[PDB]
Amino acid sequence: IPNPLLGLDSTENLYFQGIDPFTMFEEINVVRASQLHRRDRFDPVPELHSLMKEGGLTVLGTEDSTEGRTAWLATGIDEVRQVLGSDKFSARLLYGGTAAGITWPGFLTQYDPPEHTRLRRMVVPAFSHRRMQKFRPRVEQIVQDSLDTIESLGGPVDFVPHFGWAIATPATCDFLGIPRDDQADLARILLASRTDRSDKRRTAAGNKFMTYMKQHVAQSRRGSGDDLFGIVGRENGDAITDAELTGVAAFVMGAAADQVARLLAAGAWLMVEQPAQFALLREKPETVPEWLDETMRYLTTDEKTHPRVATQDVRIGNQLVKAGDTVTCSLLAANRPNYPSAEDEFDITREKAEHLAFGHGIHHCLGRAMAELMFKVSIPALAHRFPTLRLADPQREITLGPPPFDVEALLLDW
Ligand code: HEM
């Protein structure tokens, strides 16, 4: 029971007869974690900076009960690696108890070993570095086409649709063997499923996407294509279900496409804020071999991991994480430990890398090679194409939406 006589926070104050107290505990902690991972331009917000000073693991929130659950945030590099690498944390127990089945087939984030292990191993060959080498000429074409479109239009151009999404959409679709003719409509359907203010219309759009994808999976899984479905289907036969394949494909075209569009937009923004450094990349790329790792570290466009649930009492740093507690990891805090300082500032010439932008442990980014391929093609190509790239209006702040790192618009000229 919140006490609205004492405080002003709307989220904290929500109460009505018959409200679920546990649902409320989980939801306010998600909101708290989210608030902490907004950004101040490229930087952590003061609240996260303050929290980082407290120690490597702090209390996000606690349940009203005697011997109730605690939600923790890990911010120290040591604590984050320890949590994410430990077999004493479950991902699946976040979504239900032991006896609960899988909710979203193919949503790897939701699986624990041994089934996490098997399903990931089944799909891994499609995401390999070798496979990304093969995919590279297509990505190069996608990027040059996007740049041609931008240049043809004339400045100013919004790089969110014309750079982030113009690359992410065809790249993800092509990876899944989606015919060119279908792509614009699917992207439109996905927009409705991600943004429509009506939850009813949001679900109808999601349903429309998932049924297209189920059909596409059935058509493609026994075929001879180099798409994800052909690869995984030919290799695995009936060991992978249509539902599982559909989930993986949907993730790639939905959540993951959004993640890469956001990363590319954040990259283009950094380029216009740090043009002398990116001039070094354009003109002498061999002298800055760690540029990409440093960019990932600085940007950390996925600020935090999904909460993990402790399956037994476990020591994390100083603290005792009790069975049933959750720990959320701040990749942002892990990658920017020295914020603010000269050493934390973006430095394209840095050695040794860091970093944890793609997570850690068994759940670490399956799409790392694909994401890096996209970035490593896109950013240098942008630099060569528009050496004079700049903000159309240098006085206007970039508007950031809710995490993860969400550039809403990026109006650039050259
Ligand atoms: C199209 C490109 C991408 C694909 C296909 C992809 C795919 C995936 C998948 C399937 C997982 C779940 C792995 C598992 O649970 O075993 C994952 C996890 C993760 N990804 Fe990606 N990803 C992409 C881009 C990105 C980008 C741009 C970032 C941010 C830099 C990112 C950051 C992460 C992180 C931090 C995790 C771990 C989450 C956690 O531990 O809770 N990914 N990725």
Numbering used by the authors: -22 to 391
Text from the published report:
The biosynthesis of GPAs is based around the initial synthesis of the linear heptapeptide by a type-I non-ribosomal peptide synthetase (NRPS) and its subsequent modification by cytochrome P450 monooxygenases, which install the crosslinks that provide the unique structure and hence activity of the GPAs. In type-I GPA biosynthesis OxyB acts first to install the C-O-D ring (between residues 4/6), followed by D-O-E ring installation (between residues 2/4) catalysed by OxyA and finally formation of the AB ring (between residues 5/7), catalysed by OxyC. In this study we characterised the activity and structure of StaF, the D-O-E ring forming Oxy enzyme from A47934 biosynthesis. StaF adopts the canonical P450 fold and strongly resembles the structure of OxyAtei, with both exhibiting the long additional A’ helix at the protein’s N-terminus.
The StaF structure is well resolved and adopts the typical structure of a cytochrome P450, which consists predominantly of α-helices (12 in total: labelled A to L, including two additional helices labelled A’ and J’). The most interesting structural feature of StaF is the long A’ helix at the N-terminus, which forms the ceiling of the active site. This helix seems to be specific for D-O-E ring catalysing P450s as it was only observed once before in OxyAtei, the D-O-E ring forming P450 from teicoplanin biosynthesis. The centre of the active site is occupied by a heme moiety, which is sandwiched between helix I and L, the loops connecting helices B and C, K and L as well as the loop connecting the last β-strand of β-1 and the J’ helix. The I helix contains the conserved residues responsible for controlling protonation during oxygen activation of the P450 catalytic cycle (Asp235 and Gln236). These residues make the active site more polar than those of OxyB/OxyC homologues, whilst aromatic amino acids are concentrated at the B–C-loop side of the active site, with Trp81 and Phe84 in the B–C loop and Phe228 in the I helix.
